[PDB]
Amino acid sequence: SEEPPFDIRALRADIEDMISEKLELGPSLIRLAWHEAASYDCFKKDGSPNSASMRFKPECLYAGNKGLDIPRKALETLKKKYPQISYADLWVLAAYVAIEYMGGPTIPFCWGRVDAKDGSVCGPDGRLPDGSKTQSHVREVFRRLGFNDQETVALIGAHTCGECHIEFSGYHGPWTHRKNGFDNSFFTQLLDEDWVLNPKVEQMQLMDRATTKLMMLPSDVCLLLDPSYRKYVELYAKDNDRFNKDFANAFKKLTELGTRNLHKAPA
Amino acid sequence: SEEPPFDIRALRADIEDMISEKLELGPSLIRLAWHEAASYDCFKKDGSPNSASMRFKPECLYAGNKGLDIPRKALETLKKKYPQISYADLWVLAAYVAIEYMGGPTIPFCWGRVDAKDGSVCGPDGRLPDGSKTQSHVREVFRRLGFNDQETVALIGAHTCGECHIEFSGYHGPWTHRKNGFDNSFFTQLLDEDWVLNPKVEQMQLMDRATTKLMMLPSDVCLLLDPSYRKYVELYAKDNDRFNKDFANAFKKLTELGTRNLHKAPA
Ligand code: HEM
Ligand code: HEM
Ligand SMILES: [Ca+2]
Ligand SMILES: [Ca+2]
Ligand SMILES: [K+]
Ligand SMILES: [K+]
């Protein structure tokens, strides 16, 4: 639609190159964009989502954001090469590139986000979800963001990608057997495995009885326990196409929360 | 040592009769005495533990105290027959009677507690432990009460008795196979069973893979996950005698927190 002030074709290629050199960056880029959005409260209309406010104290120091300096620093290099893109647009674009890179949907990108210029616009601590909690908490957080149950379940499906790091969250390991692949595997394993206590990790997490190599957090398995969420887990477990479409729509919504004056990018 | 102002022999007999008529009262009596003590903060020296302050608003309405009106009302009948005993002494005595009734230790009773006369002395909400949380929370609560890890594990062993009620905590069912029996079965099952997610209860709890009839809360299994607590789980699983002795000592300590001027009862 409207040509951006940065060379988006070249930037996308450079993001792809960066990911290719360090594949675990892909899932961290998705996590970064999600936590930059997750500050929103749709009722108070505050939290400066999608403004790269996480670059500043106090938000950069929130426990839920531990480890996100890694994708932020990776992207800094590209910001220097493409100075016309805002950090906010860059983090969103990099997440969209990562999602596609790993086999997920190609989400239509809109540009135009303006960066937070200091930490005074940061939302408070306590807005990020807690993996040790279950559906009452998950629903409260996602309702606060403005998402319904279908969108909530679709979004949490992103745990098909990546892994937990003891240093960052105290949890350990990948959810799925192919942590650098995007698909509906998070949902299939939620339904298909027997989730047993993992006695080897001090922070309570479950593992699959079959191999012990898959993990789930309390916040993941609450999608099985809650009657509404479980219906969508079942839906996505059976249909990867539907999951991809719904994830695309929900993630686009997430990364456009609290934004204005965006422009459709050339594609 | 010192004869109380109430007929303790007759009162004990009446508590035993009451339990015999409704055996599930036994574990609720233990829970009542424990929650009446659990308000203590040993650093602030507040919370009016062991004063029967739970009789009053706001404490009676704290979420963690749901269902405790049942043992309170049961004991009211005995308070009327033995008006010289304080509610505070009565709740403690009834718990000691219940522990012995179910095969646990006979704990030496001291009398002399004075009742709270109104709710202004109630400690704040948020002092009771949360079954959905794990060892960081459990340790913080028990440290606040003044207990070490050994005592913490011994006390939680009381879950050998009784059961969860959906109406009260949202959890469902007994921990052990014999919910009206007191012994070290909570610890044996913690070590011996495979604890798998129970998909049938909306509040996350585990069940044993073998029968699915045993349950554990996140707060129970955190005793397995924490290196220090696990040592005591192992200790008590192997030695019911040691568990009984340690439970007796810890429970006596618990029910004497924040008390003064007590007298050894005739035994
Ligand atoms: C109930 C909601 C959620 C909870 C409790 C939660 C929790 C967590 C935790 C504890 C980690 C581990 C961080 C680490 O140790 O590195 C993590 C990682 C991750 N999260 Fe979530 N999250 C939630 C929702 C989401 C959503 C909505 C998205 C994106 C749409 C997402 C994307 C990711 C990704 C991709 C990773 C892997 C990061 C990496 O490999 O470096 N999460 N999440
Ligand atoms: C981490 C610490 C603890 C947690 C999280 C916890 C939590 C719970 C919960 C959720 C229930 C179910 C209540 C219901 O639904 O009726 C319960 C019941 C019970 N608790 Fe605990 N508790 C803890 C420690 C203790 C201690 C220290 C004692 C006594 C020494 C104790 C004695 C009992 C008993 C006997 C029951 C059964 C009540 C009945 O059958 O009516 N608990 N506890
Ligand atoms: Ca933010
Ligand atoms: Ca109290
Ligand atoms: K995957
Ligand atoms: K028992």
Coordinates of C-alpha atoms and ligand atoms in Angstrom, one line a residue:
Chain A
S1 CA 0.0 0.0 0.0
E2 CA 2.4 2.7 1.2
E3 CA 6.2 2.5 0.8
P4 CA 8.0 2.7 4.2
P5 CA 10.9 5.0 4.9
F6 CA 13.2 2.0 5.3
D7 CA 14.1 -0.6 2.6
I8 CA 11.7 -3.3 3.9
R9 CA 12.8 -5.9 1.3
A10 CA 16.4 -5.7 2.4
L11 CA 15.6 -5.5 6.1
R12 CA 13.5 -8.7 5.9
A13 CA 16.4 -10.4 4.1
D14 CA 18.7 -9.2 6.9
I15 CA 16.4 -10.5 9.6
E16 CA 16.2 -13.8 7.9
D17 CA 20.0 -13.9 7.7
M18 CA 20.3 -13.1 11.4
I19 CA 17.9 -15.9 12.3
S20 CA 19.7 -18.4 10.0
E21 CA 22.9 -17.7 11.9
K22 CA 21.3 -18.4 15.3
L23 CA 18.0 -20.2 14.9
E24 CA 17.0 -19.9 18.6
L25 CA 16.7 -16.2 17.9
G26 CA 13.4 -16.9 16.0
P27 CA 11.3 -17.8 19.0
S28 CA 12.9 -15.1 21.2
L29 CA 11.9 -12.5 18.6
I30 CA 8.3 -13.7 18.9
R31 CA 8.5 -13.5 22.7
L32 CA 9.9 -10.0 22.5
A33 CA 7.1 -8.7 20.3
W34 CA 4.5 -10.4 22.5
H35 CA 5.9 -8.9 25.7
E36 CA 6.1 -5.5 24.2
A37 CA 2.4 -5.8 23.4
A38 CA 1.4 -7.6 26.7
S39 CA 1.6 -4.4 28.8
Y40 CA -1.8 -3.2 27.4
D41 CA -4.9 -2.7 29.4
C42 CA -7.8 -2.2 27.0
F43 CA -10.0 -0.8 29.8
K44 CA -7.6 1.9 31.0
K45 CA -6.2 2.2 27.5
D46 CA -2.7 2.4 28.9
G47 CA 0.6 0.4 29.0
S48 CA 2.1 1.8 25.8
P49 CA 2.0 -1.5 24.0
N50 CA 3.9 -1.9 20.7
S51 CA 6.1 1.2 21.4
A52 CA 9.4 -0.6 22.2
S53 CA 9.1 0.8 25.7
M54 CA 10.8 -2.4 27.0
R55 CA 14.1 -0.7 26.0
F56 CA 13.8 1.4 29.1
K57 CA 13.8 0.9 32.9
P58 CA 11.7 0.0 34.6
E59 CA 10.1 -2.3 32.1
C60 CA 13.3 -3.9 30.9
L61 CA 13.9 -5.1 34.5
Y62 CA 10.4 -6.7 35.0
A63 CA 10.9 -10.4 35.9
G64 CA 8.7 -11.5 33.1
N65 CA 11.0 -9.8 30.6
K66 CA 14.2 -11.6 31.7
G67 CA 16.3 -12.7 28.7
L68 CA 14.6 -10.3 26.3
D69 CA 17.8 -8.2 26.1
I70 CA 19.0 -11.0 23.8
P71 CA 16.6 -10.4 20.9
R72 CA 16.7 -6.6 21.6
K73 CA 20.5 -6.5 21.2
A74 CA 20.3 -8.7 18.0
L75 CA 17.9 -6.2 16.5
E76 CA 20.0 -3.2 17.5
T77 CA 22.5 -4.2 14.8
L78 CA 19.7 -4.0 12.2
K79 CA 18.3 -0.7 13.6
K80 CA 21.8 0.8 12.9
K81 CA 21.7 -0.4 9.3
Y82 CA 18.1 0.7 8.8
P83 CA 17.8 3.7 11.0
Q84 CA 14.4 4.8 9.5
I85 CA 12.5 1.9 11.1
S86 CA 11.2 2.5 14.7
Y87 CA 12.3 -0.1 17.2
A88 CA 8.6 -0.8 17.7
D89 CA 8.1 -1.6 14.0
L90 CA 11.3 -3.5 13.9
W91 CA 10.4 -5.8 16.8
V92 CA 7.0 -6.5 15.2
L93 CA 8.5 -7.1 11.8
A94 CA 11.2 -9.4 13.1
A95 CA 8.5 -11.5 14.9
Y96 CA 6.5 -11.7 11.7
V97 CA 9.7 -12.7 9.8
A98 CA 10.4 -15.3 12.5
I99 CA 6.9 -16.8 12.4
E100 CA 7.1 -17.3 8.7
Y101 CA 10.7 -18.5 8.9
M102 CA 9.7 -21.4 11.1
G103 CA 6.8 -22.5 8.9
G104 CA 4.0 -20.4 10.4
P105 CA 1.7 -17.9 8.6
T106 CA 2.9 -14.9 6.7
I107 CA 1.2 -12.1 8.5
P108 CA 0.4 -8.8 6.7
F109 CA 2.6 -6.2 8.2
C110 CA 1.6 -2.6 8.9
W111 CA 4.3 0.0 9.6
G112 CA 4.2 3.4 11.4
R113 CA 4.6 2.6 15.1
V114 CA 6.3 5.4 17.0
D115 CA 8.9 4.5 19.7
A116 CA 8.6 5.4 23.3
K117 CA 11.3 7.9 24.0
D118 CA 11.8 7.2 27.7
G119 CA 10.6 4.9 30.5
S120 CA 8.0 7.2 31.9
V121 CA 5.4 5.8 29.5
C122 CA 6.1 2.2 30.7
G123 CA 3.1 0.3 32.1
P124 CA 3.4 -1.1 35.6
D125 CA 4.9 -4.4 36.6
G126 CA 2.5 -7.3 37.0
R127 CA 0.8 -7.2 33.6
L128 CA 2.7 -10.2 32.1
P129 CA 1.3 -13.6 32.6
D130 CA 2.7 -16.0 35.2
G131 CA 3.5 -19.6 34.0
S132 CA 2.9 -21.0 37.4
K133 CA -0.7 -19.9 37.4
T134 CA -3.8 -21.3 35.7
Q135 CA -6.9 -20.4 33.8
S136 CA -8.4 -17.7 36.1
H137 CA -5.1 -15.8 35.7
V138 CA -4.7 -16.5 32.0
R139 CA -8.3 -15.4 31.3
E140 CA -7.9 -12.2 33.4
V141 CA -4.7 -11.3 31.5
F142 CA -6.1 -12.0 28.1
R143 CA -9.4 -10.3 28.8
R144 CA -7.4 -7.2 30.0
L145 CA -5.6 -7.2 26.6
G146 CA -9.0 -7.5 24.8
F147 CA -8.8 -11.1 23.6
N148 CA -11.5 -13.7 23.7
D149 CA -11.0 -17.4 24.5
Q150 CA -10.4 -18.5 20.9
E151 CA -7.7 -15.9 20.4
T152 CA -6.1 -16.7 23.8
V153 CA -5.7 -20.3 22.9
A154 CA -4.4 -19.5 19.4
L155 CA -1.8 -17.2 20.8
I156 CA -0.5 -19.5 23.5
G157 CA 0.1 -22.0 20.6
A158 CA 3.2 -20.0 19.9
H159 CA 4.8 -22.3 22.6
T160 CA 5.2 -24.7 19.7
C161 CA 8.3 -22.6 19.1
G162 CA 11.2 -22.2 21.5
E163 CA 12.1 -23.2 25.0
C164 CA 12.3 -22.2 28.6
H165 CA 15.6 -21.2 30.1
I166 CA 16.4 -21.7 33.8
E167 CA 18.2 -18.4 33.8
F168 CA 15.2 -16.5 32.5
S169 CA 12.1 -18.1 33.9
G170 CA 13.4 -21.0 36.1
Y171 CA 11.7 -23.5 33.8
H172 CA 13.7 -25.7 31.5
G173 CA 13.4 -27.0 28.0
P174 CA 11.3 -27.0 24.9
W175 CA 7.6 -27.6 24.8
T176 CA 7.6 -29.6 21.6
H177 CA 9.8 -32.1 19.9
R178 CA 10.8 -29.5 17.2
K179 CA 11.3 -26.3 18.9
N180 CA 12.4 -24.4 15.8
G181 CA 9.3 -25.5 13.9
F182 CA 6.0 -23.7 13.9
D183 CA 2.8 -25.7 13.8
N184 CA -0.1 -27.0 15.9
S185 CA 2.1 -29.5 17.8
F186 CA 1.6 -27.7 21.1
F187 CA -2.1 -28.6 20.9
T188 CA -1.6 -32.2 19.7
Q189 CA 0.8 -32.9 22.5
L190 CA -1.5 -31.3 25.1
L191 CA -4.2 -33.7 24.2
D192 CA -2.2 -36.8 23.3
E193 CA 0.4 -37.1 26.0
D194 CA 0.1 -38.0 29.7
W195 CA 1.5 -35.0 31.6
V196 CA 3.3 -36.2 34.7
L197 CA 5.2 -34.2 37.3
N198 CA 8.9 -33.6 36.3
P199 CA 10.7 -34.3 39.6
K200 CA 14.0 -32.9 38.2
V201 CA 13.1 -29.3 37.8
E202 CA 12.6 -27.2 41.0
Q203 CA 10.0 -25.0 39.4
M204 CA 6.9 -27.2 38.9
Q205 CA 6.5 -28.2 35.3
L206 CA 5.1 -31.3 33.6
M207 CA 6.7 -33.7 31.2
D208 CA 5.3 -36.3 28.9
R209 CA 5.3 -39.8 30.3
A210 CA 6.3 -41.3 27.0
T211 CA 9.7 -39.6 26.5
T212 CA 10.0 -37.1 29.3
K213 CA 11.5 -34.7 26.7
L214 CA 8.4 -32.5 26.2
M215 CA 7.3 -30.0 28.8
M216 CA 4.2 -28.1 29.7
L217 CA 3.7 -25.3 32.3
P218 CA 0.7 -25.0 34.6
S219 CA -0.4 -22.2 32.4
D220 CA -0.3 -24.4 29.3
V221 CA -2.2 -27.3 30.8
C222 CA -4.9 -25.0 32.2
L223 CA -6.0 -24.9 28.5
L224 CA -6.9 -28.5 28.9
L225 CA -8.6 -28.0 32.3
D226 CA -10.8 -25.1 31.3
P227 CA -14.0 -26.2 29.4
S228 CA -13.9 -23.3 27.0
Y229 CA -10.2 -23.3 26.3
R230 CA -10.2 -27.1 25.8
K231 CA -12.6 -26.8 22.9
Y232 CA -10.1 -24.6 21.0
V233 CA -7.2 -26.9 22.0
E234 CA -9.2 -29.6 20.3
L235 CA -10.0 -27.5 17.3
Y236 CA -6.4 -26.5 16.7
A237 CA -5.1 -30.0 17.4
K238 CA -7.2 -31.3 14.5
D239 CA -6.6 -28.5 12.0
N240 CA -3.2 -26.8 11.5
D241 CA -4.6 -24.6 8.7
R242 CA -7.2 -23.1 11.1
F243 CA -4.5 -22.7 13.8
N244 CA -2.3 -20.9 11.3
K245 CA -5.1 -18.5 10.2
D246 CA -6.3 -17.9 13.7
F247 CA -2.7 -17.3 15.0
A248 CA -2.1 -14.9 12.2
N249 CA -5.2 -12.9 13.0
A250 CA -4.6 -12.9 16.7
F251 CA -0.9 -12.0 16.5
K252 CA -1.6 -9.2 14.1
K253 CA -4.2 -7.9 16.5
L254 CA -1.8 -8.2 19.4
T255 CA 1.0 -6.3 17.6
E256 CA -1.4 -3.5 16.6
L257 CA -2.9 -2.9 20.1
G258 CA -2.7 0.7 21.1
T259 CA -1.5 1.8 17.7
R260 CA -2.7 4.4 15.3
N261 CA -1.8 5.7 11.9
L262 CA -0.3 2.5 10.5
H263 CA 0.2 1.8 6.8
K264 CA 0.0 -1.4 4.9
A265 CA 3.5 -2.5 3.8
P266 CA 4.4 -3.6 0.3
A267 CA 4.3 -7.4 0.0
Chain B
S1 CA 0.0 -30.2 86.3
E2 CA -2.8 -27.7 86.9
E3 CA -6.5 -28.6 86.9
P4 CA -8.5 -26.5 84.3
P5 CA -11.7 -24.7 85.1
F6 CA -13.6 -27.1 82.8
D7 CA -14.0 -30.9 83.2
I8 CA -11.4 -31.9 80.6
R9 CA -12.0 -35.6 81.0
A10 CA -15.7 -35.2 80.2
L11 CA -15.0 -32.7 77.4
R12 CA -12.5 -35.0 75.7
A13 CA -15.1 -37.8 75.9
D14 CA -17.7 -35.5 74.3
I15 CA -15.3 -34.4 71.5
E16 CA -14.6 -38.1 70.8
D17 CA -18.4 -38.8 70.7
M18 CA -18.9 -35.9 68.3
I19 CA -16.2 -37.2 66.0
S20 CA -17.6 -40.8 66.2
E21 CA -21.0 -39.5 65.0
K22 CA -19.4 -37.7 62.0
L23 CA -15.9 -38.9 61.3
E24 CA -15.1 -36.3 58.6
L25 CA -15.2 -33.8 61.5
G26 CA -11.9 -35.1 62.6
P27 CA -9.8 -33.7 59.8
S28 CA -11.8 -30.4 59.7
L29 CA -11.0 -29.9 63.5
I30 CA -7.3 -30.2 62.6
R31 CA -7.7 -27.7 59.8
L32 CA -9.6 -25.3 62.1
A33 CA -6.8 -25.2 64.7
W34 CA -4.2 -24.9 62.0
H35 CA -5.9 -21.9 60.3
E36 CA -6.5 -20.2 63.7
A37 CA -2.7 -20.4 64.3
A38 CA -1.6 -19.7 60.7
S39 CA -2.3 -16.0 61.0
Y40 CA 0.9 -15.4 63.0
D41 CA 3.8 -13.4 61.8
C42 CA 6.8 -14.1 64.1
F43 CA 8.7 -11.0 63.0
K44 CA 5.8 -8.5 63.5
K45 CA 4.6 -10.6 66.4
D46 CA 1.0 -10.1 65.3
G47 CA -2.0 -11.9 63.8
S48 CA -3.5 -13.0 67.1
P49 CA -2.9 -16.8 66.5
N50 CA -4.6 -19.3 68.8
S51 CA -7.2 -16.8 70.0
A52 CA -10.2 -18.1 68.1
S53 CA -10.3 -14.8 66.2
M54 CA -11.6 -16.7 63.2
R55 CA -15.0 -16.5 64.9
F56 CA -15.2 -12.9 63.7
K57 CA -15.3 -10.9 60.5
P58 CA -13.1 -10.2 58.6
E59 CA -11.1 -13.4 59.3
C60 CA -14.1 -15.8 59.0
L61 CA -14.7 -14.6 55.5
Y62 CA -11.1 -15.0 54.2
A63 CA -11.1 -17.4 51.2
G64 CA -8.6 -19.7 52.9
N65 CA -11.1 -20.2 55.8
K66 CA -14.0 -21.3 53.7
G67 CA -15.8 -24.3 55.2
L68 CA -14.4 -23.8 58.7
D69 CA -17.8 -22.7 59.9
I70 CA -18.5 -26.4 60.0
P71 CA -16.1 -27.4 62.8
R72 CA -16.7 -24.1 64.5
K73 CA -20.4 -24.7 64.8
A74 CA -19.8 -28.3 65.9
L75 CA -17.7 -27.1 68.7
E76 CA -20.2 -24.4 69.7
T77 CA -22.4 -27.1 71.1
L78 CA -19.6 -28.3 73.4
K79 CA -18.7 -24.7 74.4
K80 CA -22.3 -24.4 75.7
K81 CA -21.9 -27.5 77.8
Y82 CA -18.4 -26.6 79.0
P83 CA -18.6 -22.8 79.1
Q84 CA -15.4 -22.5 81.1
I85 CA -13.2 -23.4 78.2
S86 CA -12.1 -20.6 75.8
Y87 CA -13.0 -21.2 72.2
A88 CA -9.2 -20.9 71.6
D89 CA -8.4 -23.8 74.0
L90 CA -11.4 -25.8 72.7
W91 CA -10.3 -25.6 69.1
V92 CA -6.8 -26.7 70.0
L93 CA -8.0 -29.5 72.3
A94 CA -10.5 -30.7 69.7
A95 CA -7.7 -30.9 67.1
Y96 CA -5.5 -32.9 69.6
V97 CA -8.4 -35.2 70.3
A98 CA -8.9 -35.6 66.5
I99 CA -5.3 -36.4 65.8
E100 CA -5.2 -39.1 68.5
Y101 CA -8.6 -40.4 67.4
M102 CA -7.3 -41.1 63.9
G103 CA -4.2 -42.9 65.1
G104 CA -1.8 -40.0 65.4
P105 CA 0.3 -38.9 68.4
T106 CA -1.2 -38.0 71.7
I107 CA 0.0 -34.4 72.1
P108 CA 0.4 -33.0 75.6
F109 CA -2.2 -30.2 76.0
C110 CA -1.7 -26.9 77.7
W111 CA -4.7 -24.8 78.6
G112 CA -5.1 -21.1 79.3
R113 CA -5.6 -19.4 75.9
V114 CA -7.8 -16.3 76.0
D115 CA -10.3 -15.7 73.3
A116 CA -10.3 -12.7 71.0
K117 CA -13.4 -10.7 71.9
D118 CA -13.9 -9.0 68.5
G119 CA -12.5 -8.9 65.0
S120 CA -10.3 -5.8 65.4
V121 CA -7.5 -8.1 66.5
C122 CA -7.7 -10.2 63.4
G123 CA -4.6 -10.4 61.2
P124 CA -4.9 -9.4 57.6
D125 CA -5.9 -11.5 54.7
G126 CA -3.2 -13.2 52.7
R127 CA -1.4 -15.0 55.5
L128 CA -2.9 -18.5 54.7
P129 CA -1.0 -20.6 52.2
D130 CA -2.2 -21.1 48.7
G131 CA -2.5 -24.7 47.4
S132 CA -1.9 -23.6 43.8
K133 CA 1.6 -22.3 44.7
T134 CA 4.9 -24.1 45.3
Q135 CA 8.0 -24.1 47.5
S136 CA 9.0 -20.4 47.4
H137 CA 5.5 -19.6 48.7
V138 CA 5.3 -22.5 51.2
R139 CA 8.7 -21.6 52.6
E140 CA 7.9 -17.9 52.9
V141 CA 4.7 -18.7 54.9
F142 CA 6.3 -21.2 57.2
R143 CA 9.3 -19.0 57.8
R144 CA 6.9 -16.2 58.7
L145 CA 5.3 -18.6 61.2
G146 CA 8.7 -19.4 62.6
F147 CA 9.1 -23.0 61.4
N148 CA 12.1 -24.6 59.8
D149 CA 12.0 -27.0 56.8
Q150 CA 11.7 -30.2 59.0
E151 CA 8.7 -28.8 60.8
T152 CA 7.1 -27.5 57.6
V153 CA 7.2 -31.0 56.0
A154 CA 6.0 -32.7 59.2
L155 CA 3.0 -30.3 59.4
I156 CA 1.9 -30.7 55.8
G157 CA 1.8 -34.4 56.5
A158 CA -1.5 -33.7 58.1
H159 CA -2.9 -34.0 54.6
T160 CA -2.9 -37.8 55.3
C161 CA -6.2 -36.9 57.0
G162 CA -9.3 -35.5 55.2
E163 CA -10.1 -34.2 51.8
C164 CA -10.6 -31.2 49.6
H165 CA -14.1 -29.9 48.9
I166 CA -15.0 -28.2 45.7
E167 CA -17.2 -25.8 47.6
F168 CA -14.4 -24.7 49.9
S169 CA -11.1 -24.7 47.9
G170 CA -12.2 -25.7 44.4
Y171 CA -10.1 -28.9 44.8
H172 CA -11.7 -32.3 45.1
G173 CA -11.0 -35.5 47.0
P174 CA -8.8 -37.1 49.6
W175 CA -5.0 -37.1 49.4
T176 CA -4.6 -40.7 50.7
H177 CA -6.5 -44.0 50.4
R178 CA -7.6 -43.8 54.0
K179 CA -8.7 -40.2 54.7
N180 CA -9.8 -40.9 58.3
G181 CA -6.5 -42.5 59.2
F182 CA -3.5 -40.7 60.5
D183 CA 0.0 -41.9 59.4
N184 CA 2.9 -41.2 57.1
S185 CA 0.9 -42.2 54.0
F186 CA 1.0 -38.7 52.5
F187 CA 4.8 -39.1 52.2
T188 CA 4.9 -42.6 51.0
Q189 CA 2.5 -41.8 48.2
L190 CA 4.4 -38.6 47.3
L191 CA 7.4 -40.7 46.6
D192 CA 5.9 -43.9 45.4
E193 CA 3.2 -42.8 42.9
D194 CA 3.5 -41.2 39.5
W195 CA 1.6 -37.9 39.8
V196 CA -0.2 -37.1 36.6
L197 CA -2.4 -34.2 35.7
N198 CA -6.1 -34.8 36.6
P199 CA -8.0 -33.6 33.5
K200 CA -11.4 -33.8 35.3
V201 CA -10.9 -31.1 37.9
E202 CA -10.8 -27.5 36.8
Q203 CA -8.5 -26.4 39.5
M204 CA -5.1 -28.0 38.7
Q205 CA -4.4 -31.0 40.9
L206 CA -2.5 -34.2 40.3
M207 CA -3.7 -37.8 40.7
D208 CA -1.8 -41.0 41.0
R209 CA -1.5 -42.8 37.6
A210 CA -2.1 -46.2 39.3
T211 CA -5.7 -45.7 40.5
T212 CA -6.4 -42.0 39.9
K213 CA -8.1 -42.0 43.3
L214 CA -5.3 -40.2 45.2
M215 CA -4.6 -36.5 44.8
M216 CA -1.9 -34.0 45.4
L217 CA -1.9 -30.2 45.2
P218 CA 0.9 -28.2 43.7
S219 CA 1.8 -27.2 47.2
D220 CA 2.1 -30.9 48.2
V221 CA 4.3 -31.9 45.3
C222 CA 6.6 -28.9 45.8
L223 CA 7.9 -30.9 48.8
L224 CA 9.3 -33.4 46.3
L225 CA 10.7 -30.7 44.0
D226 CA 12.6 -28.8 46.7
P227 CA 15.9 -30.4 47.6
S228 CA 15.6 -29.6 51.3
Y229 CA 11.9 -30.6 51.7
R230 CA 12.5 -33.8 49.8
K231 CA 14.9 -35.1 52.4
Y232 CA 12.2 -34.9 55.0
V233 CA 9.6 -36.4 52.8
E234 CA 12.1 -39.3 52.4
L235 CA 12.7 -39.4 56.2
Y236 CA 9.0 -39.5 57.1
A237 CA 8.1 -42.0 54.3
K238 CA 10.5 -44.5 55.9
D239 CA 9.7 -43.9 59.6
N240 CA 6.1 -43.4 60.8
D241 CA 7.3 -43.2 64.4
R242 CA 9.6 -40.3 63.6
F243 CA 6.8 -38.6 61.7
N244 CA 4.4 -39.0 64.6
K245 CA 7.0 -37.6 67.1
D246 CA 7.9 -34.7 64.8
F247 CA 4.3 -33.9 63.9
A248 CA 3.4 -33.9 67.6
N249 CA 6.2 -31.4 68.4
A250 CA 5.4 -29.2 65.4
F251 CA 1.7 -29.1 66.0
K252 CA 2.1 -28.4 69.6
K253 CA 4.4 -25.5 68.7
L254 CA 1.9 -24.3 66.1
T255 CA -1.0 -24.2 68.6
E256 CA 1.1 -22.4 71.1
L257 CA 2.3 -19.6 68.8
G258 CA 1.6 -16.2 70.3
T259 CA 0.4 -17.7 73.6
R260 CA 1.4 -16.9 77.2
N261 CA 0.5 -18.2 80.7
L262 CA -0.5 -21.7 79.7
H263 CA -0.7 -24.6 82.1
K264 CA 0.0 -28.3 81.6
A265 CA -3.3 -30.2 81.6
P266 CA -3.9 -33.4 83.6
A267 CA -3.3 -36.4 81.5
Ligands
HEM1 C1 -0.6 -17.7 29.6 C2 0.2 -17.0 28.7 C3 1.8 -17.2 28.7 C4 2.6 -17.6 29.6 C5 2.3 -18.0 31.1 C6 4.0 -17.7 29.1 C7 5.1 -18.0 29.7 C8 6.4 -18.2 29.1 C9 7.6 -18.6 29.8 C10 7.7 -18.9 31.3 C11 8.5 -18.7 28.9 C12 10.0 -19.1 29.1 C13 10.9 -17.9 28.9 C14 12.4 -18.4 29.1 O1 12.7 -19.1 30.1 O2 13.2 -18.1 28.1 C15 7.9 -18.4 27.6 C16 8.6 -18.4 26.4 C17 8.1 -18.1 25.2 N1 6.8 -17.5 24.9 FE1 5.3 -17.6 26.3 N2 3.9 -17.3 27.8 C18 2.5 -17.0 27.5 C19 2.0 -16.6 26.3 C20 2.7 -16.4 25.1 C21 2.2 -15.8 23.9 C22 0.8 -15.2 23.8 C23 3.2 -15.8 23.0 C24 3.3 -15.3 21.6 C25 2.2 -15.3 20.8 C26 4.3 -16.5 23.6 C27 5.5 -16.8 23.0 C28 6.6 -17.4 23.6 C29 7.8 -17.9 22.9 C30 8.0 -17.9 21.3 C31 8.7 -18.4 23.9 C32 10.1 -19.1 23.6 C33 11.2 -18.0 23.8 C34 12.5 -18.5 23.5 O3 12.7 -19.7 22.9 O4 13.5 -17.8 23.7 N3 4.0 -16.8 24.9 N4 6.6 -18.1 27.8
HEM2 C1 1.5 -25.4 52.2 C2 0.6 -25.6 53.2 C3 -0.8 -25.9 53.1 C4 -1.7 -25.8 52.0 C5 -1.4 -25.1 50.7 C6 -3.0 -26.3 52.4 C7 -4.1 -26.4 51.6 C8 -5.3 -27.1 51.9 C9 -6.5 -27.1 51.1 C10 -6.7 -26.4 49.7 C11 -7.3 -27.9 51.7 C12 -8.8 -28.2 51.2 C13 -9.8 -27.5 52.0 C14 -11.2 -28.0 51.6 O1 -11.5 -27.9 50.4 O2 -12.0 -28.4 52.5 C15 -6.8 -28.4 52.9 C16 -7.4 -29.2 53.8 C17 -6.8 -29.7 55.0 N1 -5.6 -29.2 55.6 FE1 -4.2 -28.2 54.5 N2 -2.9 -26.8 53.7 C18 -1.6 -26.6 54.1 C19 -1.1 -27.0 55.3 C20 -1.7 -27.6 56.3 C21 -1.3 -27.8 57.7 C22 0.0 -27.3 58.2 C23 -2.2 -28.5 58.3 C24 -2.2 -29.1 59.8 C25 -1.1 -29.4 60.5 C26 -3.2 -28.9 57.4 C27 -4.4 -29.6 57.6 C28 -5.4 -29.9 56.8 C29 -6.4 -30.8 57.0 C30 -6.5 -31.9 58.1 C31 -7.3 -30.7 55.8 C32 -8.6 -31.6 55.5 C33 -9.8 -30.8 56.0 C34 -11.1 -31.6 55.8 O3 -11.1 -32.8 55.5 O4 -12.2 -31.0 56.0 N3 -3.0 -28.3 56.2 N4 -5.5 -27.8 53.0
CA3 CA 5.2 -2.6 26.5
CA4 CA -6.0 -16.5 63.7
K5 K 7.5 -26.7 17.3
K6 K -4.7 -41.1 55.8

